[PDB]
Symmetry: C5
Subunit: 247 residues, 5 copies
Amino acid sequence: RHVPEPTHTLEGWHVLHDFRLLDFARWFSAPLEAREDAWEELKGLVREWRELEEAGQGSYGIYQVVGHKADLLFLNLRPGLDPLLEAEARLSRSAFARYLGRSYSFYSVVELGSQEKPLDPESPYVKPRLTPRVPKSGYVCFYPMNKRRQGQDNWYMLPAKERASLMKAHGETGRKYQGEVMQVISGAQGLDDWEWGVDLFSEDPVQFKKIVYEMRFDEVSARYGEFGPFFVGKYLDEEALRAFLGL
Amino acid sequence: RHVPEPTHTLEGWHVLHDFRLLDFARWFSAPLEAREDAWEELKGLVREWRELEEAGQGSYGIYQVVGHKADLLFLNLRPGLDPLLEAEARLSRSAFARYLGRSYSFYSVVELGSQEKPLDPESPYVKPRLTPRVPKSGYVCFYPMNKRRQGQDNWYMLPAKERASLMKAHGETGRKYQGEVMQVISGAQGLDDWEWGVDLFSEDPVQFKKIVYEMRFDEVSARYGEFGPFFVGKYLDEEALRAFLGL
Amino acid sequence: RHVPEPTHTLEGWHVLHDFRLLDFARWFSAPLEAREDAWEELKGLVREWRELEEAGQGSYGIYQVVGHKADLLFLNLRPGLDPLLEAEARLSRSAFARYLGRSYSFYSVVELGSQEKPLDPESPYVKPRLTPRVPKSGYVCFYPMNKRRQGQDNWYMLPAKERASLMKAHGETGRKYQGEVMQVISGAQGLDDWEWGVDLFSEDPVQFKKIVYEMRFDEVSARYGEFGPFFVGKYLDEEALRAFLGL
Amino acid sequence: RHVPEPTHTLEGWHVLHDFRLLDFARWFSAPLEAREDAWEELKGLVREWRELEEAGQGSYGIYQVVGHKADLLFLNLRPGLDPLLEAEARLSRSAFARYLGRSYSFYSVVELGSQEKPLDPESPYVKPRLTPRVPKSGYVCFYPMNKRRQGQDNWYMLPAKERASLMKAHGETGRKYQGEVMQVISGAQGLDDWEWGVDLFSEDPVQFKKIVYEMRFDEVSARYGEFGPFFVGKYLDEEALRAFLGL
Amino acid sequence: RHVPEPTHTLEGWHVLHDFRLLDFARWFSAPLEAREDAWEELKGLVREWRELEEAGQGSYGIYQVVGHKADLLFLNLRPGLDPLLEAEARLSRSAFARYLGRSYSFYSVVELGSQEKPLDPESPYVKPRLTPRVPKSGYVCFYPMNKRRQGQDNWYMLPAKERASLMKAHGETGRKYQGEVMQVISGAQGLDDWEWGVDLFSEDPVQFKKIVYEMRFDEVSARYGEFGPFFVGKYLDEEALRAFLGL
């Protein structure tokens, strides 16, 4: 009979992608003092996220997202779900949130995978990847995905050896962009609607187009990739966010 | 000629998953007296569920759900549909519900299945599972699912003997998780949009990730698993719910 | 080349499933007089439907539906579409509908099919099924469905003899449910989004789960069944609806 | 090397299906004078459509649609897109439209196809079909559709002679309904979300059910039919629409 | 041992399709002062886009879109994402946007592909296509699309040579449309929900119907074409937009 050879994984920081749409009409028409009050509270919340990051308790990033799918991405990473629930609840109860609508979200956990043998969690070549720091500049590309389980294209029924080969080739394609595109892979198996969440960071959004298109020709993607929506956002420092909000 | 060998089942308590979204802006901006009044009335309702649970007439749990899919999960189990319709209507007419929006739900019945030899309804390891009590700590993972009926992967066309061997391997894979994960399977065949509802309980949400991912490599899941949305929530006792609502 | 052998059918009463969601917050917070006035008008409209049923000129049923998909199902059967258009338009124009939101619906016609030999519309064993009367108690299970037309599982390409064999087996499976489950099959080909509408009536909703699950193992269902959403509701007489509305 | 044999087509009048939902609560709660003023303006707009129809510059039809998908269908056929955009904009600007919400629509062009031999636009057996007149009575059945391109069932990869034989059989099945059902086929390739728009007109809606179901057994429909939603409406003359609006 | 041969691409201007729905009721019933102030502000915004285009630093187009999918399309092309984020942000905060609802959007980058060798960005047959100018008249047809990856129809698994042959045939079919239809292909791999965005410009919308239908018979489209929604709009100059808004 079929002998399962489950992929080995290591979990790192938990991740929450919080996408929201801005009610432009309501925000820009609100009394200036009300907007300033909301602005002070918002900055205070973000300073707290920054504080946690400096204490090595997570990472975060806020982005201006292009298109109708979302306007602002509040990305947070923490040591567990509770701190994420906290960050999410606090944002949701903020005065600024009164002018926002949740459009999409994703709960996942930083995942390091290995198809054949378990990874050494204490290896200096593995451990740092468990707690990725979000770049404070550039752009981000986020998209969820599953590994196909259809007809003759069933990733989960393949022998571990074949999966290892397919993943190695995929990793090699990705490394052509070493130093150009940073990648954070998170798993949402049993946690959200898709099996993985993927974050790509770069100083030029065109790099996202180059790497994603090229990777689609790797057999692992061509035959086994099932992709969800793609969100592209530009990193916003405090001043950039202030300008975005018209303050 | 095809001869059907339908899976044997034993039905237990009826189950209702009631997912709702909180209108943060309206709730946190509402007069303090209005919030307190809604809170007092909510406690009275939850007290009824508590007393019913103490009497062995059902069970319940309230959770803080991560993400945009839902904010609060009101889980209730009863000996029939009527008590569920009652609990559901009572919550909906409460003052607190004026600040809630229904985002998702699932109606199902606790189900114990056997592919070949019928289960002993009197077995001490069978009977108690018909009336599972919701644990009072940790987290919950809920997701609905169907058994695939596509091309060569048609679960319902398989001989009972093959389905039995497929389920045995599944049960084996999940045995290593028994110590950390509790599982409640409910059937919604002619009751809701998916064939089964699955509730996983654990003190660590990462356990949900490990078990769901590892199980996907079992042939039963890899070839016949069709999965719906995944919701993760943190169990909230009275004080936790109060704190979440800012009271 | 291909010689079609279309299924023979007899059409009876037209059917309209009108599913609505109740705005609990607005209804239960509305002034008593407005509620009583809306209730008086609603009773009168339903009374008209009841009088038509008593005259043997149609049938109706109002149900409390579990879950977020709908709260109230207004089921009506008439000799044609015109009185159904009236039924829904009048409910929508009622004051009570100011507190309702249309969530789903289905327009179909009671259909009695035969794969090979045409049915006799004047036969004592056939004619009565053309104008079924909705049970004035118990519960209802409604779900729409199609007959699969994919790859090797193409119902419409099958010879009539094979379809007759598949349907006969389906009939044998449901025979043991004769005394506990009433079934009404209606066709919506060219009338709505699905090919058929299925109504199951029983004094116990668990019977819906039992029959639907068991039948899924019949080849006709396993290979050719394509199912839509499932709605379960409890029949409400006048006093039960009054109580549901808090009056 | 695949040699394409594209279907020959002749284009006639452009077509717009404008489906809207009526805000019953708001309309029937509005002051009687406001309703009358809106009605008078609406009649005037429709009178304009009737005038151009009498001049032979188009055709129109307004229907009361069953179910939640739509309440009113404003069907218009014109020599081009511009006059359709005008009729669409004029209706949207009307006071009556303040009580309407767009639920669905379809932009297409009357199409007469031929798989092998090109059609003569001046032929008396072809020309009149380019500018069909909407029956001023009865009912309508509208549904968009595509020709399947999946696996072994790829309509667009077939040789023209096969497509011709497949369409011939379809026509033979439909000749039976010639005196009871009138059909208008419009193409929306490159114009809307589906490849074709299909309008069926008849004095009895059951005829729609009969023809659509029987045709599904033809190989062209069974293997290559990909159907969208089905809308059924009752033709409304001026007096009937007035009655529907409670005036 | 599959060896990937990824398609080479040259990237030109970044493109943003911003589709919005007009709240007709709110706009046309709003005070004249409000409408005029909004119009004057919108004109100023568009003038900035116009001047930008005159300086060869981009291109734009505003269209009246037929149907319920959108009413106005604000199309913009710029040297990067930043200018696009600025354009949609500026439009979103305008007084006019208070009367608009975002219904759809697409972020992509003009793409010139070549299946086997790098293209020369300086060739007189290549360079101009990198910065396409939106025609100031006629109509537009927009639709997103993917290249199929299903079973035996997997574009990404094909040898580069075969993909070249398929595309060459596609180009030969489009030859006859040379002087009637202008096409701009943009890639959104890693940028949006579909792999490509396609814009067709013509003085007659029927040309869109002719070319899209004919091309569907080419093997590349028949077997590998996966199409999204289709939008058709009429180009509006300042005067036409003014008239559309009743000013």
